Structure 1
Amino acid sequence: MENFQKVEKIGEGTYGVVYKARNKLTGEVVALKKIRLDTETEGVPSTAIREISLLKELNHPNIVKLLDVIHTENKLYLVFEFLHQDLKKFMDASALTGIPLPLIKSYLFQLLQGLAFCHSHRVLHRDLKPQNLLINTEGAIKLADFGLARAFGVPVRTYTHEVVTLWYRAPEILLGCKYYSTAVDIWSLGCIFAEMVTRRALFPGDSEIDQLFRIFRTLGTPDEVVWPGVTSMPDYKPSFPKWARQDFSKVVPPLDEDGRSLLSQMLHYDPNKRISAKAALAHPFFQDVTKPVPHLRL
C-alpha cells in the first residue's frame, strides 16, 4: 500500500473511513476504505466480509467497482473507483432551482438498472439513501456502501429486522413483517424519487411510530382491502388514526401523469403488488430517457 498517496478525507460509511488517494503508478484517482482490524474484537467485521464478497460478483456500470483488496498489518484497505459527489450534496447544491426533469429521469433510470442487476443476483442493498448514490461529472449515478447488503436465498427466511435508515424504511419493515424481500429496496427508491422532484425528504420522521404515521398521513391508513394482512401484522394496533390518501398532485406537484403513476407503484403498501425494478424500467415514464451531464460544483 506504499503505492497510494492520500489526498483528502471523503467521509465515513457503514464502517471504516474513506479517503481520496492517487495511485502513483498509473496516476488515477481512487477511493480507499480503511478498516482498523486491531480495534475489531471479532476479527474482520461481518459487514466488511459481506461487501467484499458481494462486490466481487456484481460488475455493473451502476455499481461502484471494488478495484482491489489489500491487507497491511492491522489494516484492511478496499480500493474502490472514484466518484465526484453524492446525490445528497448535489440536491442541496441545487435546492433553489431543482434538478431538471430529464436529469431526474436519467438518475432514476440508472438506479433501477443497478437494482435489477443486484436483485437478479439475489442481493438486497437495504441501505438506499442519498448519501450512498454517487454521481460523477459524466452524468452517471452508481450505488455504493454495500456493507448493509445481504444475499437472500430462494426461498428467503427471517433476516435482520430493523434495517435501512429510518427516513427510507418500508412500512412492512416498520410493522415487524416476518419476511421481507426485494420490495424494500423499491420503496427506498420511491422515497428518493420524490426527494429529487420535491428536493426534501418525503417522510421525515424522528421515531418509528412518527415515520409510520407520516407514511399513513401521506398515503392513507392501510386496511385489508389495500394490504391484506396488515390487520394481523405484529406491530399493527387498531388505534391507528384514519387518514385518506393525499392526492399525488399535491405530494409531488412537478411530476407529470406518468411519473405520478410510477411513484404510486413504487410506493405501494402491499409488498407483493409493489412494482419491481425490472417492471419499472418498462414504464412509459422511461420512454424518452437521456443521459444529461450535470454541472457539478466540484
Structure 2
Amino acid sequence: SMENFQKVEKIGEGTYGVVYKARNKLTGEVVALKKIRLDTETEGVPSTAIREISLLKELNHPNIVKLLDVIHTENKLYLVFEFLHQDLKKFMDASALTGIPLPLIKSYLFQLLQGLAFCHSHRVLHRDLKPQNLLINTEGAIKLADFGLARAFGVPVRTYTHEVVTLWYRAPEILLGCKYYSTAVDIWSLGCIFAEMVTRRALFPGDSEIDQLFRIFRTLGTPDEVVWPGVTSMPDYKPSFPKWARQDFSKVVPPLDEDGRSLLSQMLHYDPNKRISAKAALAHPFFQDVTKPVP
C-alpha cells in the first residue's frame, strides 16, 4: 500500500518508470518514489528494475543514492529513494553565466569518483553517467543515481549490451562496436562531465553515432594504431574516417589548470586499457587540496 505516501510533484522519467517527490504522512520524511506499472508489462518485473534493486541494495556509500524500500502493490512496483532537491544538469544551467566555482567542481568530481570507485570495486558498471542522473543536496554532496542501465560485470568481462550510455557521454570503444567494454566506459562519461562543469556546455554534443565519433576525433585527434592498438580493425572503424589533428587542451577547457588538464586527458584516453581508473584518479595531484564547499 502507498497509503502512507502523499505525492508532492512529478520529478522526472529516467531509464524506466516515473519518479515523484513524495512525503511519508506518518514520519514526514521526504522521498523520491519510482513507480513502475506491471499491468503494462507483458514480461513481468522488468530487467532494469531487477538490476537496479539488486545492485543498489549492495551499494551503501555516501555518493550513491540510497534505496530505502521496495513495495509491491496491486499491479505496481514502487522503489523508495532518499530525496535530493536537484540534479547536476539544472545546477549547471543555473550557473551557465556565473560558472561553477572551481573548488566545487573539484569537490563534485572527487565525490563522483569515490562513488564510481565503490561501484567498480563491487563489480557494477553504471553505463548511464550524465548530469541528469547526478543528484545534489544543499550541503555540498553529489550522488550517483539511476542504476536502471547498470549491470554486474564479471572478471574478465564478456560481451554485454551494445546499446548503452546516453550518446553525448558514450565512449569511443562502444561507438566503434568493440566486442568488450568495461569500467573505462564510466570514466569516459565522467571525463565528459568534468569538462562540462568547467566550460558549462557539453563537450561532445553529437546528433548521431557517426557525428558523435567525429566530434570526439576533432577534439582529441583521429586515433591510429600508435595511440590505440587495434583501433583500425574494430567492427565499425572505417579507413575513410577523416584524420583530424589533436587540439591543445588550453583551447578545449580554457579555465582548467595544468593538474586539471592532466587528469582530464587521462580520463579521455582513447585506449580503454590505459584510461585512468576511478581509484587512480582519486590519487591524482588535482585533488591534493580538495575541500567540500556548500553550493
- Indicate the residue corresponding to 1:161 in structure 2: 162
Residues 1:100 and 2:101 aligned together = yes
Q: Secondary structure at the match of 2:258?
A: coil
* Cα displacement (A) at 1:28: 1.0
Question: Relative to structure 2, which stretch is displaced further, 186-195 or 24-33?
Answer: 24-33
Give deviations 1:161-192, integer Å, cap 9, x for gaps: 12101001100000000000000000000000
Match of 1:32 in 2: 33
1:194-230 CA distance string (max 9 Å, x none): 0000000000110100000010000001011110000
SS at match of 1:56: helix
Take 1:187 and 1:238, find their aligned partners in 2: how far apart are those partners? 24
1:77 counterpart SS class: strand
**Which residue number in structure 2 is paired with residue 245 of structure 1?**
246
Secondary structure class of the residue paired with 1:78: strand
Residue 24 of structure 1: CA displacement? 1.4
Unaligned runs of 5+ in 1: none
Compute the displacement of 1:242 (Å).
1.1
Give SS of 2:120's match: helix
What secondary structure does 2:189 align onto?
A: helix
Distance in structure 1 (CA, Å) of the matches to 2:11 and 2:237: 41
Identity %: 100
> Following TM superposition, by how much is the alpha carbon of 1:3 offset from its aligned partner in structure 2, in angstroms?
0.8
Q: Secondary structure at the match of 1:231?
A: helix
Deviation at 1:231, TM superposition (A): 1.1
Deviation string 1:75-127 (CA, Å, 9 cap, x unpaired) is 10000000010000000001001000000000000000000000000000000
- Distance (whole Å) between structure 1 residues aligned to residue 23 and residue 56 of structure 2: 22
1:154 shift after superposition:
1.3
Corresponding position of 1:205: 206
1:143 aligns with 2:144: yes
2 CA distance for matches of 1:162 and 1:230?
A: 20
Give the secondary structure class of the aligned counterpart of 1:243.
Answer: coil
TM-superposed deviation, 1:25: 1.7
Whole-angstrom CA distance in 2 between matches of 1:160 and 1:72: 31
Q: Report the 3-state secondary structure (helix = DSSP H, G, I; strand = E; otherwise coil) of the residue aligned with 2:58.
A: coil
**1:155: how far off?**
1.7
Taking the aligned partners of 1:41 and 1:167, their CA distance within structure 2 comes to 32
* C-alpha separation in 2, matches of 1:17 and 1:90: 21
SS of the equivalent of 1:148 reads coil
Q: 2-side partners of 1:205 and 1:124: how far apart?
A: 23
1:20 pairs with 2:21 = yes
Report how far residue 48 of structure 1 moved.
0.5
Question: What residue is the counterpart of 1:4 in the other structure?
Answer: 5
In angstroms, what is the RMSD of aligned CA positions? 0.5
Corresponding pairs, count: 294
- TM-score normalized by structure 2? 0.99
* Partner of residue 110, structure 1: 111
1:54-85 residue CA offsets vs partner (Å, 9 max, x unmatched): 00000000000000000110010000000010
What are the superposed Cα offsets for residues 115-146 of structure 1, whole Å, 9 maximum, x if unpaired?
00000000000000100000010100000000
CA–CA distance in 2 between the matches of 1:289 and 1:25? 40
Which SS does the other structure have where 1:146 is aligned?
coil
Which segment is superposed worse, 8-17 or 265-274? 8-17
Question: Which ranges of 4 or more aligned residues in structure 1 deviate by more than 3 Å?
Answer: none
For 2:44 and 2:31, the matched residues in 1 are separated by 26
Q: Following the alignment from structure 2 to structure 1, what is the Cα–Cα distance between the partners of residues 9 and 162? A: 36
Cα distance in 1, alignment partners of residues 246 and 163 from structure 2 = 26
* Correspondence for 1:67: 68
- What residue number does 1:230 align with? 231
DSSP-derived class of the 1:96 partner: coil
TM-score (norm 1): 0.98
**What is the deviation of 1:286?**
0.3
Give 3-state SS (helix, strand or coil) of 1:8's partner. Answer: strand
Give me the whole-angstrom Cα distance separating, in 2, the residues matched to 1:13 and 1:272: 30
